[PDB]
Amino acid sequence: RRLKKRIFAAVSEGCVEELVELLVELQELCRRRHDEDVPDFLMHKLTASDTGATCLMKALLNINPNTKEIVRILLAFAEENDILGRFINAEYTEEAYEGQTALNIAIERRQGDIAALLIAAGADVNAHAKGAFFNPKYQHEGFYFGETPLALAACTNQPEIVQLLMEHEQTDITSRDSRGNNILHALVTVAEDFKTQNDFVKRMYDMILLRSGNWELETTRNNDGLTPLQLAAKMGKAEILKYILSREIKEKRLRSLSRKFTDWAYGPVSSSLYDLTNVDTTTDNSVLEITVYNTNIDNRHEMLTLEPLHTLLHMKWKKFAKHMFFLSFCFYFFYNITLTLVSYYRGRMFVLIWAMCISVKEGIAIFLLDAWFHFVFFIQAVLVILSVFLYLFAYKEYLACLVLAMALGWANMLYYTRGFQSMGMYSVMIQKVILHDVLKFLFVYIVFLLGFGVALASLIGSFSDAVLELFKLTIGLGDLNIQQNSKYPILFLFLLITYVILTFVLLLNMLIALMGETVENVSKESERIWRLQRARTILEFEKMLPEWLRSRFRMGELDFRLCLRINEVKWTEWKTHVSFLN
Amino acid sequence: DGLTPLQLAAKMGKAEILKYILSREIKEKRLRSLSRKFTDWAYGPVSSSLYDLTNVDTTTDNSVLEITVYNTNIDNRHEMLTLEPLHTLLHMKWKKFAKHMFFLSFCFYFFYNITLTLVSYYRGRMFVLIWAMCISVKEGIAIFLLDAWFHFVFFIQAVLVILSVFLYLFAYKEYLACLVLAMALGWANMLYY
Amino acid sequence: ETVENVSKESERIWRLQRARTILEFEKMLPEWLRSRFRMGELDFRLCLRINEVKWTEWKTHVSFLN
Structure with missing residues (x-):
């Protein structure tokens, strides 16, 4: 603590008159072998031991225009005192920056030449920042980049540093960190679509993939067992998965990395093949099953208009x-008609075995953990079977269960309108309106209803008669002139008028709020949620089939790779291409 | 009027100049007390910083935050309330x-309204009058303040409950009108919370 | 009249209402028990350990810088 704080201040600011004296001061300090503590002087006084921050990490933490003095201090102690083995591999002590070298900090502050010369001094590019800040809980709390130097050069938009780092002989490209991620996993982890940044991620991801030139990168699974485009699908990033699912290489010697074998193009019409490595539900964790069964991102219609994904559907x-x-609609229709005739006029009991079958079908609702229609199907099934099991008994509580099962079943028939697009977009707006705005209007209307009903019942008819008269006044009925046991009917009169005008202004506020929320959900968002609903029932009906009889996949092995004879026509793109080309 | 320059910047309603005041750093030395954002470490996207609390804190008599929240004649206060040590402090x-x-104040008002509901409907029988006196001397600063409507509804509910009880002591039948109007305005006043 | 007051102006007036009841509930407390202010003297100046993240600004900065 004697004068190492002075050299810390000297590498902080950059006063050279302390530095030139202090470099020979430490030289005559190490020349005078003190002979009571020979090795600990070098390992303790050429660094700090409170936070583990050494001198050059302090200098690269305090980057100023004094690049001459940082070139001097890399060429002062690192080679004369022959310390570089135990020195440049120094890590921290705390939990925030646990295991952080000077290479990632050197490339983090645009100093590629400093980092290239210090790896030319013999550092290690296989550092692993295992701190809990570096592996955070959410995206906002911390920086996740892959805890690797070439991964940090990939995320922080530095192509020249990763160009000089890939050409080093002992770097790793198949390296896997604490999450097991390679360069492509972390590069799509830091990625996002074109709505925020100007797409450097794909524009150097191509450089990483063709500089590597090997297939073994794109099968390295993480701890959750995910291929890189599966992780690209799960985190919800559009254009990078667009680049993955449509990628061709014109020149040869790298042909297995391609995925779009264009066999013939002619004006607008162009046939192509694609791959079916993982975009097909015959594998255990497909891309399509992930991007249909995902639930926490909203932009799934961006990915479901990609080519072998949309085309496959x-x-x-x-x-x-x-x-x-x-066929499922016809079965549900005949089940509802037989329940209609059995309920109205009193194969008399097909409805109970069909209700048991639909109950053990929809009994996975507690095992799945906007799947509302499963709950309505389950409550209809248990209500039919409770009505029949009380019909066996001698009770009169069974007809209520039958009439409620009738109401919920013939309301549940309206689920089967998805498939008619001009009625399915009408259908999902009903779900949007009851979810969002009518519940708030009911939540204010119930407390206004109670606050007037307790008041009018305290004026003395009863409670449940006055609140029923208030609801009949709302829907448009109910006499109001002279009620019994009024102290003064003037106050009853203008309390009733105050209730009616408050209900009117509440209705007006509700209707203009739900007019104010539909600025973009007029035809668009209903169409995306309808196409996502149709894709979810595609996959739900497809996985219910047994392991045989699925002869409904695509073309054979062209090593062994399934393909698709897809003939896309881009008329507007061809017209703009041949118009702007000449 | 005894105002520091950023307090006058807050009171007249100007956004970007107060943005420059509340976030100002100087890179070169010899002028360091004029800075207000000591950036201690930045790393990619994540950057920790310090700020000042010279006047942006309600422990002083006339703070910046108290001025730009209690101001009433400009409309763009959400421009200033998304500034950093102001928004972050909140x-x-x-x-x-x-x-x-x-x-806790919602639970007290809810239990007061439920005891007034049961006392009004079925006829600790009289917690409502001492709570009404407490809320009346609480909201009696409405004439001393000179869109604070809910203060007026709270005050008219308090005086209506105490007028209904002081006529319930008497032998009058003009008290039940005051109780039923106090019931209507109280259960409408629950919607403030 | 609701060409712009659909979600925006209601949100600003709601945040201003919440800030006004922050200050009204805060000033009602007595002179003691307010150990709820921020970090100590660094002459003597109180500060705040504020960790802001500007993801979009960092992405545009490192995209336009190179």
């Missing part, structure tokens, strides 16, 4: 799912 | 204690 649906959906 | 002042104090 039509084949899976036109092929078999329209007929399977119409 | 979360600490609120998550810290004010959610629990607000929920």
